[PDB]
Paper text:
ZNF512B, previously named GAM/ZFp, is a vertebrate-specific ZF protein. One common protein identified in all screens was the ZF protein ZNF512B, which comprises eight ZF domains, arranged in four pairs. In addition to its eight ZF domains, closer examination of the amino acid composition of the human ZNF512B protein revealed a sequence within its internal region (I), resembling the known NuRD interaction motif (NIM), also referred to as the FOG-1-like motif. We have identified ZNF512B as an RBBP4-mediated NuRD complex-interacting protein that represses transcription in both a NuRD-dependent and -independent manner.
As in previous work, we expressed His-tagged full-length RBBP4 in Sf9 insect cells, purified the protein, and reconstituted the RBBP4–ZNF512B complex by combining RBBP4 with a synthetic peptide comprising the ZNF512B NIM (residues 419–430). In the structure, RBBP4 adopts a barrel-shaped β-propeller fold with a prominent acidic cavity at one of the apical surfaces. The entire 11 residues of ZNF512B (419–430) can be confidently modeled in the structure, revealing that the peptide binds in an extended conformation to the acidic surface of RBBP4. K429 lies on an acidic surface that is made from E41 and D74 in one of the two copies of the complex and E41 and E75 in the other. Thus, K423 interacts with the side chains of E126, N128 and E179, whereas R422 forms an ion pair with E231 and the backbone carbonyl of N277. Additional electron density was observed in the R422 pocket, and this could be fitted to a molecule of formic acid, which was present in the crystallization buffer and makes electrostatic interactions with the R422 guanidinium group. In the RBBP4–FOG-1 structure, the side chain of R3 lies on an acidic ‘shelf’, forming electrostatic interactions with the side chains of E231, N277 and E319. However, a 130° rotation of the backbone psi angle of R421 in ZNF512B reorients the side chain of this residue, causing it to face away from RBBP4 and toward the solvent. Instead, the side-chain amino group of K419 occupies the corresponding shelf and forms an essentially identical set of interactions with RBBP4 – with the side chains of E231, N277 and E319. To quantify this observation, we applied competitive fluorescence polarization (FP)-based experiments using unlabeled ZNF512B iNIM, scrambled ZNF512B iNIM and FOG-1 NIM peptides to displace a ZNF512B tracer from RBBP4. This experiment revealed a strikingly low competitive inhibition constant for ZNF512B’s iNIM (ki = 19 ± 7 nM) in comparison to FOG-1’s NIM (ki = 1200 ± 500 nM), indicating that ZNF512B binds RBBP4 with >60-fold higher affinity than FOG-1.In summary, we have identified a functional internal NuRD-interaction consensus motif in ZNF512B that facilitates a high-affinity binding to RBBP4.
Residue numbers in the entry:
A (entry chain A): 10 to 88, 114 to 410
B (entry chain D): 1 to 12
Write the structure that this text describes.
Amino acid sequence: DAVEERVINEEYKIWKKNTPFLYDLVMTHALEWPSLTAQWLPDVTRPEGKDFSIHRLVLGTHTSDEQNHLVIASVQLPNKIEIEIKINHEGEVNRARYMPQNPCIIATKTPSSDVLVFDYTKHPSKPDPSGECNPDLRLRGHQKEGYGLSWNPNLSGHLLSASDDHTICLWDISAVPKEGKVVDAKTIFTGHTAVVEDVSWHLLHESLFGSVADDQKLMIWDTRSNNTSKPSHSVDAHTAEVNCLSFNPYSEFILATGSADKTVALWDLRNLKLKLHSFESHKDEIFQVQWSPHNETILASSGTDRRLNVWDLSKIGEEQSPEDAEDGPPELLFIHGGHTAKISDFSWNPNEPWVICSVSEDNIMQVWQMAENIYN
Amino acid sequence: KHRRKQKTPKKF
């Protein structure tokens, strides 16, 4: 008797009637197969004499059969969503992330525990009908599949991966030609005692990265340390498993973690003994958390409650209407209730402020932007 | 905890 589907359908109806007053853009597209990953590509082309620009998204497939693909889709944003490239992928794409120093390079996480590296300019637009997956690099060192995947934005070719085997693998492919070879992990970090759900390099200091795991711990690691079994700092972050973390791109000391305790925790690297803030509103386990690329105080989180919350830490502690207090805390800026299933991933558009692409379990891809009067 | 990915995804 799990008619949460009844609650879902009715909420969706009320949301669909209220799209015009809460959104400046709503694009909905059903994919052939659901995507577990979503990330805007940094390039954008604006044709002359036209009202739309072309943005690209790195997607993947999650199929039950043996025809998985790494997908690149194009999006026409004002001021149509179509697939552009489909590359044969061994198993479903757990996560796909492009290299910041070369967005042609895309790393993927596979169910076989291998991390695959693709140069999508070295593959045809139509996938190989034979069914063979030909990665430009095969990264080895993991025993189980995972979901944490992070390119170092200050050390080119340094890639981290978090897996269910309780380990974090680091690869240095900067000196390796991408000719289909197998590369073993340069370093394996074993500080966690449970499934490592996410990993992320620090966005400014090339030697630092964070990890979160099912042991409810956030760990801050330094590659300069010789001990790979113990991190620099281990933080009891949450009262349940921690599924995601994300560093602030404008505040070198701030990071956020999302957890199965339904909360998002704010952290300061200078004093990790005190959780800065606890963002509360989510009604179920949180899977993804991402800082806004344009505003240092704006942060978003998504998860199994089929919601995407957008937070504004500058509004923490604000006095609010009693009725307004019923809708949520003051730092809760916006609740995106467009998805009718669990949201797997989401990405902030780095060229169009406040535009977000979110993907859900029901094959639904949504490209949306909250109304200007809400944040402005 | 919720599975990171569903057991059987469906084609559209």
